[PDB]
Structures are given as C-alpha cells and as structure tokens.
Amino acid sequence: QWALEDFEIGRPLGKGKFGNVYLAREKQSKFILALKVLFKAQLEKAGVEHQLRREVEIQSHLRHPNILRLYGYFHDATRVYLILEYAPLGTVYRELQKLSKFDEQRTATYITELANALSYCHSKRVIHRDIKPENLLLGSAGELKIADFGWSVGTLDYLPPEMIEGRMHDEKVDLWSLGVLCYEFLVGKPPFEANTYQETYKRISRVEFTFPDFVTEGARDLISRLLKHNPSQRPMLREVLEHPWITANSSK
Numbered sequence: 001q002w003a004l005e006d007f008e009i010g011r012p013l014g015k016g017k018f019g020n021v022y023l024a025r026e027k028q029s030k031f032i033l034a035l036k037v038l039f040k041a042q043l044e045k046a047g048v049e050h051q052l053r054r055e056v057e058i059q060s061h062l063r064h065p066n067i068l069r070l071y072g073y074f075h076d077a078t079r080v081y082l083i084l085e086y087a088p089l090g091t092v093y094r095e096l097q098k099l100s101k102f103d104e105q106r107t108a109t110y111i112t113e114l115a116n117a118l119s120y121c122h123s124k125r126v127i128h129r130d131i132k133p134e135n136l137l138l139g140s141a142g143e144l145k146i147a148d149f150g151w152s153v154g155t156l157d158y159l160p161p162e163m164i165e166g167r168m169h170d171e172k173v174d175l176w177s178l179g180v181l182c183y184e185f186l187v188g189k190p191p192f193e194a195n196t197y198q199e200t201y202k203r204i205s206r207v208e209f210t211f212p213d214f215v216t217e218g219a220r221d222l223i224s225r226l227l228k229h230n231p232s233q234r235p236m237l238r239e240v241l242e243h244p245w246i247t248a249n250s251s252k
C-alpha cells in the first residue's frame, strides 16, 4: 500500500543496530508519525527477518492506549520501513536519566498503565519479554506506550530466572519484569545490575536484590512479591492493580 514517496522525512528520532527512526509526515494527510528504517541488508546479516514480521504481526493486530500503534510497513530494494505511531515525549529511559529517579506516584502510575497494557496482551496470548525503559515511550498525555516486539512470543537485566536458566516460561515472565521496572523507577537502576553478564546471571539466578532505605515499605512489598523466583508465586496483574500501594499512589 504505502511507498516512500508518500512521506516527508524529518528530524531523526533514533539510532540502533539495524537503522534509524525518523519523524515523518504523510504527504496527503498531513499525518505525523515515526518511520523506523531497517535494511534488507542488516536484517539478513544478523538474521532476524522471522522476528520482524512477527513484530509486524503482533504490534499490528494489537490495539491499546499504552501500546505503540503500528500502522503499517513497506520495503523497497535496499530496505524495510515501519510506520509507527509517534510518541511526543520520548522514552521513560531518558526521563529517568534526567530525573535519575521517579517518585512513588509516578512509578505507580506507570506500573498500572503498564499492568493494563500487559493485561491486554496476555488476554490475546502475547508475551513481550523485553520491557526495558529504553522500550517505553511517552505519549502527549505523558502516558506509557510500549514499543518494540522483536522478542515477543543481549542484556539480561530484565529477564527472569526461568528465561535466563533456559527453562519453561509462560506469561509470568512479564510480572518479573514489571517488578524490575518498578524497582528501577524508584531506585534509578535495576535491582540486578552488575558489571558483567556473568555476575548478572548469578545475581538474577539467586534473586539477590536489596533496597535502599528510602524505599517505602509498601514498595518493597510489591516488588518482592513480583520478584519471586518461582513463577507461580507471582501476583496477578489484577492483584498488582489492586495492590494498596498501587491504588494509594496511582494518579491514573
């Protein structure tokens, strides 16, 4: 359907191994969006084309206020293009670097936004597995929007013990993540951060994390509950939504 001569490319939005994303405007519509630009070259080099049109599939058939709309796609000779919803306020990552850490009410809000988002996906039997801040865009409202689905069905920091060890994994993975994310939001760095892959593997495996003093009790409560070694003991997104520190602090 869409070609490249339908668009006016604008300021670049991002880098990344496979190419760039650019702000762009749909010529006949004046519509604003992001163009992710990827090569038929580099795709088949670091072989992933499977995962691609999977992401294409998944982020397509999906609809939710906290999932980045994917509108479409197209390739030429040299490359493949992704027509994305554009998210004004950039990444949760950058806001973090900027603020170095978020307050409880912010954290909690995101968590909800995130929970529900995750909820919709689980409802449609989709697991994301890679919900890192880098992957979390912000809408005009400032609302969590979840990009990327390359690994929807590398750094370990966000992976749970099952995945890391090589074992059987179901949708509970995302609850581990939500826990990590949650910890990161509040503390500024993730609970299992190491200087090497190897240390991280162990730290994660032994679920070794600690809290700085300023972490309110209820926070600890929720993260601990989410960061259980055993998938089974992990809350339900429901309970997560219904947690008393969530609902006491979630502005949304």
Ligand SMILES: O=C(Nc1ccccc1)Nc1c[nH]nc1-c1nc2cc(C[NH+]3CCOCC3)ccc2[nH]1
Pocket: 013, 014, 015, 021, 034, 036, 068, 084, 085, 086, 087, 088, 089, 090, 091, 093, 094, 095, 134, 137, 147
């Ligand atoms: O696909 C990516 N991929 C991607 C590439 C690089 C970084 C993040 C995402 N990004 C986007 C998809 N839709 N909208 C975006 C988007 N990227 C943005 C970047 C900025 C600039 N800055 C980034 C750091 O945080 C502050 C803002 C602003 C708004 C944006 N919307």
